[PDB]
Amino acid sequence: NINDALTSILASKKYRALCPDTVRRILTEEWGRHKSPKQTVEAARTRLHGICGAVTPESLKAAAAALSAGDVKKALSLHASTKERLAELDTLYDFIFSAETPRRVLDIACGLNPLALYERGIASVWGCDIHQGLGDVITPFAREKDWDFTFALQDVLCAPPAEAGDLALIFKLLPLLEREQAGSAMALLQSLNTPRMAVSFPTRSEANYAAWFEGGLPAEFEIEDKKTIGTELIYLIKKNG
Ligand SMILES: Nc1ncnc2c1ncn2[C@@H]1O[C@H](CSCC[C@H](N)C(=O)O)[C@@H](O)[C@H]1O
């Protein structure tokens, strides 16, 4: 059954750090394609491969090493998403925090971005992602710095973020979610317990993310700002209600 397959996949070195719900989610969808378990499992592994960033145990090790040496910039360069943001990092957050600087930030599908929030003096951060390796990198650092950061191994398509905050960051995530499950992107934004959010899209290929987002954003949200900074198209939105 699905549970047996989940147990076998989580025992492998390649996927042992993946969120169990993620493995089950993919397994369940593949099982719906009725197949000899052989086939099902193999189709699931093929999908799990590129579910976190196509992100290795080696990259995470290096990240923690650089972090343990106080080299935050180097750690950020060890994760593809934060590395490509390095050049305009401060320009980006000056934009997001221009109006108000949040006391508590929720980083949805955080990757290693929380490290950038630390250097920005953000007091409280809660981040969630599907690879424990990410939390294994940030958590020990936060502890040393006596920084209030918490990591949750959580698949947002299985359980929405339950935490409350002043601002939520949803960087380079909606495209992936929407492709995994239609309508899940806007559903996620509605589930966030924050009055404001910052959403970003990659500029490389919803062929047109701007048209998709502006035309599909639920009525309870209002777009207050839209700007392209570096490799990202960012939207500052307000959730009313
Ligand atoms: N269903 C899901 N739930 C939670 N996180 C997910 C997810 N599917 C993919 N992710 C995570 O989404 C991230 C996309 S890369 C963007 C990382 C970070 N927001 C940044 O901008 O630097 C990856 O870290 C991936 O592991």
Side-chain angles (χ1 to χ4, degrees):
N1 58 19
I2 293 176
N3 279 359
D4 295 325
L6 175 61
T7 296
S8 291
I9 291 177
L10 288 175
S12 69
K13 64 178 176 180
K14 188 177 180 183
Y15 301 116
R16 62 163 86 290
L18 274 185
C19 173
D21 285 323
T22 297
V23 178
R24 178 189 291 285
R25 178 165 61 75
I26 283 155
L27 233 25
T28 303
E29 289 191 0
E30 290 304 313
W31 216 272
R33 308 228 230 300
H34 293 119
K35 277 307 194 161
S36 69
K38 169 169 187 183
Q39 211 137 348
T40 314
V41 171
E42 282 323 90
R45 280 210 179 68
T46 293
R47 276 185 63 178
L48 291 172
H49 174 268
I51 204 86
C52 292
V55 177
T56 62
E58 296 105 308
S59 56
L60 301 174
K61 289 185 175 62
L67 211 48
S68 295
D71 193 346
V72 177
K73 252 61 63 182
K74 190 178 182 183
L76 286 167
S77 71
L78 288 170
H79 185 289
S81 187
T82 40
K83 184 185 179 180
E84 61 184 2
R85 181 177 297 121
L86 243 22
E88 305 293 4
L89 190 57
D90 294 306
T91 307
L92 174 74
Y93 282 113
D94 286 341
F95 172 69
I96 297 174
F97 302 153
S98 77
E100 337 175 304
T101 290
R103 172 273 180 172
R104 184 168 168 70
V105 172
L106 306 186
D107 202 342
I108 317 304
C110 70
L112 289 188
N113 180 67
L115 296 172
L117 297 183
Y118 170 67
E119 297 210 303
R120 266 287 172 152
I122 300 303
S124 183
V125 174
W126 177 87
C128 68
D129 209 296
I130 54 175
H131 195 309
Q132 182 57 50
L134 301 168
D136 289 349
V137 168
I138 307 168
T139 302
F141 180 67
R143 299 289 69 78
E144 163 177 51
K145 300 293 181 178
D146 249 287
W147 181 45
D148 175 26
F149 165 79
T150 299
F151 177 77
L153 185 59
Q154 184 178 333
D155 188 310
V156 297
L157 293 176
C158 301
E163 301 301 318
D166 299 303
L167 176 72
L169 301 184
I170 310 89
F171 295 175
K172 306 171 183 173
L173 176 66
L174 302 193
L176 300 176
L177 292 178
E178 190 63 23
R179 176 177 48 175
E180 206 83 326
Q181 186 186 317
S184 69
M186 295 307 180
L188 170 63
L189 298 187
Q190 294 179 297
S191 75
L192 301 177
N193 203 357
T194 61
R196 289 191 174 65
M197 289 151 260
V199 181
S200 82
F201 300 82
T203 54
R204 75 166 73 82
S205 62
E206 311 172 309
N208 190 308
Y209 291 141
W212 172 78
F213 189 71
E214 287 162 38
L217 189 59
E220 65 269 24
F221 296 89
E222 70 185 66
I223 294 178
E224 305 189 308
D225 240 310
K226 171 187 169 184
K227 177 185 264 190
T228 294
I229 296 176
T231 65
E232 304 173 87
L233 162 60
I234 309 85
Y235 288 82
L236 301 187
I237 66 183
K238 188 176 185 295
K239 193 186 69 170
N240 302 299

